[PDB]
Each structure stands twice: as C-alpha cells, then as structure tokens.
Design a binder for this molecule. Structure first.
Ligand SMILES: [Cl-]
Length: 470
C-alpha cells in the first residue's frame, strides 16, 4: 500500500528498476535521500536539487532527511505506514552492511525490501560465481568472464501519487552548501554541474561527438574538463551505465557496420565494473594491512611530503598543476592520475597509496569507496599484477602531454612567465629567466621536493627487491 524508494546512488529517474517495481501495487510513493570537500558536496546537492525539481514536475518531491538510516527508517515506517522499501543494489562492503541492517529492521516492521541491480551492467555476484567464488584479480580475466555473460519522456511515478505537506520545503528540502557549513564566497560556477538532467544532455552530445568529430588519442586539450565527460555522472548514478552502454553499442553499430565493437569502446564502463567486483566481498579493500589482494609494501610515513603533494607544492609543476586542477574542479584526466599517483607512491615519495586515496576521496568527483581504493592499488602496483619496472617522469610526461606547458600556466599562474623550455622544470632556468618570469625558484615557487633521478632509481630497485629476484 505505502511505499518508499531510497536514493543513495541511482540519483536519477531514468533506468530505475527498483523505483518502477516499488510502485507496482502501491497507493503512495515517497522517494527519500538520507544525508568531504566542497566540490563533492556541491555536486551531490545539485543532484538532489535536480531530482527534487524533476519529481516536482510529476507532482512529487524528493524527501531529504539528515540522519543515520538505522535511526530514521523505523519511525518513518511507522508514521507513513510503510510496507515496501526499494533500493538500487549497492555492491560496496559497507553499503551491504548498511543495507543488511536496514533489511533486518524492515523485516521486523513488516516491510518488504525490493532490491534491483542497476548501478552496474552486471550482477557482480554472478561474475564471482563464474570465477569460483573470488573476484578476478586481473582486468583481462574479468573481461573474459563478462564476455561469457550478457547477450525517457515518461512519468516514472505515473501509477502512483505522493502525499505532500505545506511545510515540505522546510522539513524535507535539499540543504544548501551554507547549511552544511561551507563558506561559499570562494566558488565560481561548477565546472561539473550535478544531476540527471545534465547527465542526459551530456550523453547526447557525447554520442554526437563519437559519431561526428570522431569514430581517440591524447592531446593537451584532453587535460581540461570536457563538456561531454560522463564519469562523475556515472559514479553518482545520474547517468545509467546501462543506458550509456546500450546507446554506445547501437550508435557504434549504426556508424560502423556490424562490428563486434572493441573492448576499448567500453573501457570506462568495464574498468569501473572490475573494481566494484574486486571490492564487493572485501571489507579491507581500502587497506594494505589485512587486505588479501594487496601486496604488502614498506611505505614511509612523511606527513610533510604528503601535504606538499596533496596541496600541489611539490616543486614539480606537472604534479602541482594536476593536484591544483583536482582541488579546484574535482576532475583530472586518467593519465594525470597515473602521474600524481605514481609520484606519491612507487615512483618518487614512497608514501602509501592509502594516503593518496584519502585525498582523492576528499576531492575527486568520480571516486567512490571501491573505485578509489582499486585505482590507487592499481596505480601504486599494490595489486592487479601491475608493472613497476617503469616510473612516470614528472617532467617528461607533462612535456609530452602538453608540449607548450599551457596546462601549467593555467593551474599555476605563478609560473605563467616561464618559457616552454623550462615550464616543466623551472629549477633549470637561468636566474635571469626566473627573474623575468617574476618567479624565483625557492622563493615564489618551491624547489622540487625530491631528486627525481635518484628517488625513482632507488624506489624501482626497492620495489624490485620486495619480490624474489631470479
Ligand atoms: Cl546508479
């Protein structure tokens, strides 16, 4: 009779099978959302504003509640006389633990829990069954398992109604950044605007781009936020990965013949799936110690080095530029992640991937518990059989990605006056050049915090020797 849909990810009305099923046989439906850096919070709140606005258009509203689910749902169930609760499935270990506790409470209150998988393409548990009860520990094996697996104008609440009270905006309104305790004087408009509406606009354009302008290699421009980038939208569920996957496939077929498209066309999607699968039964996935798939590495504790890196004050412009864009905007290119993750961990500073992961959790829009832990193990060569015999150069990688160094000048204006010859290694500029640039190295911008040549040589050696050498 009275039903609730509970938003956590899946922050969208399109491709929402849990919501659709929840509404079957229901008199009433209420959609609820139960409440570290400012960009993440802004993105979430914009998602919630978008949902509320779109629900409004259907004579509904989003119900935002501040509290712990375990403390909220029982009295909600009683007040509203709820007998059905639906959720999109969450594979993440702390998510499963949360949802297990809420199921217990719901069973206690006579409340049916409806669970549908739609944050991912696949049933992750079935992949694990196909692999003998443990996740594939290499991306290639995962690709093989899934190949042996698979083959918006409506009113999503049309069959139901939502009771609404006059004080809804007050009681159940989406909070503002200020209400969450943020200072807002220091924000321009978001580079990555939140919400389903935006996601669906970007999807169309994304697909237009793949068809028209393309049918894809790195250039300097790729380092900047694309207006057709989808990765934050996927992580929040603003864009269904299944919709994305289906649209891609059909357009590929339209444009290219039959063509059994390359795995590379689904790389974004499959890599995220791979880490969710790796994480789902591993409550220590975000740890080194006690984590069964993590190689144990003698990382060092250097809180000042970690802070220099986190803050973009390493003295390597390439690294600092990247960490500055990350903090300013909330997204950086996957190749830029390689650079700054390699620098912090196996390459230059020898600091645990756990520590890098924490910073990214605070700043990176498309990071969640599974993806972020997974990526950081991958980039530090702590898991997934990744190769540690090469170390990204914190000068050359940048110089090969943006030869002119505009990216540097863009995120590090203090360096704007250096010529391209020195913009990735300003410490090598003659002092007169530094002076013309109005930037003395050591004074206005720091010296490089490490000798890359030595650091990288020693660390590759030390990583090699953690393993038996033949
Ligand atoms: Cl989702």
């Amino acid at each position: 009779v009275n039903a609730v849909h509970w938003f956590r990810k899946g922050l969208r009305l399109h491709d929402n099978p849990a919501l659709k099923e929840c509404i079957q046989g229901a008199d009433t439906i209420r959609c609820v959302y139960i409440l570290v850096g400012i960009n993440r919070w802004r993105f979430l709140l914009q998602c919630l504003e978008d949902l509320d606005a779109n629900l409004r258009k259907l004579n509904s509203r989003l119900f935002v509640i501040r509290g712990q689910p375990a403390d909220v749902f029982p009295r909600l169930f009683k007040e509203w006389n709820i007998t059905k609760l639906s959720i999109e499935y969450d594979s993440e270990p702390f998510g499963k633990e949360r949802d297990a506790a809420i199921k217990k409470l719901a069973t206690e209150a006579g409340v049916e829990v409806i669970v549908r998988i739609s944050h991912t393409l696949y049933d992750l548990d079935k992949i694990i069954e196909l692999n003998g009860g443990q996740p594939p520990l290499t991306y290639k094996r995962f690709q093989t398992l899934v190949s042996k697996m698979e083959p918006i104008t409506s009113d999503v609440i049309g069959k139901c109604m939502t009771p609404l009270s006059d004080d809804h905006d007050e009681k159940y309104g989406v909070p503002s950044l200020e209400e969450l305790g943020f200072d807002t004087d220091g924000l321009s408009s978001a580079v990555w605007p939140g919400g389903e509406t935006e996601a669906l606009t970007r999807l169309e354009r994304h697909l237009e781009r793949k068809a028209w302008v393309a049918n894809p290699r790195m250039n300097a421009n790729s380092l900047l936020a694309s207006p057709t980038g989808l990765s934050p939208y996927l992580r929040f569920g603003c864009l269904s990965c299944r919709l994305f996957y289906f649209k891609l496939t059909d357009l590929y077929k339209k444009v290219k013949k039959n063509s059994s498209p390359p795995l590379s066309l689904y790389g974004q999607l499959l890599w995220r799936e791979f880490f969710y699968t790796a994480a789902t039964n591993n409550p220590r996935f975000d740890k080194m110690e006690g984590n069964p798939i993590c190689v144990q590495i003698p990382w060092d504790k250097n809180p000042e080095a970690l802070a220099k890196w986190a803050e973009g004050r390493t003295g390597f412009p390439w690294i600092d530029a990247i960490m500055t864009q990350l903090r300013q905007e909330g997204w950086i290119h996957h190749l830029a992640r390689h650079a700054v993750a390699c620098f912090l961990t196996r390459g230059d500073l020898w600091i645990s991937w756990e520590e890098g992961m924490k910073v990214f959790e605070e700043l990176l829009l498309d990071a969640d518990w599974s993806i972020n832990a997974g990526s950081w193990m991958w980039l530090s060569c702590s898991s997934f059989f990744q190769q540690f015999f090469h170390c990204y150069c914190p000068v050359g990688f940048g110089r090969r990605t943006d030869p002119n160094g505009d990216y540097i000048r863009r995120y590090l204006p203090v360096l704007r006056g250096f010529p391209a010859k020195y913009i990735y290694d300003p410490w090598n500029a003659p002092e007169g050049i530094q002076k013309v640039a109005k930037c003395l190295i050591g004074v206005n911008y720091p010296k490089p915090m490490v000798n890359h040549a030595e650091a990288s040589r020693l660390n590759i050696e030390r990583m090699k020797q953690i393993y038996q050498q033949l």
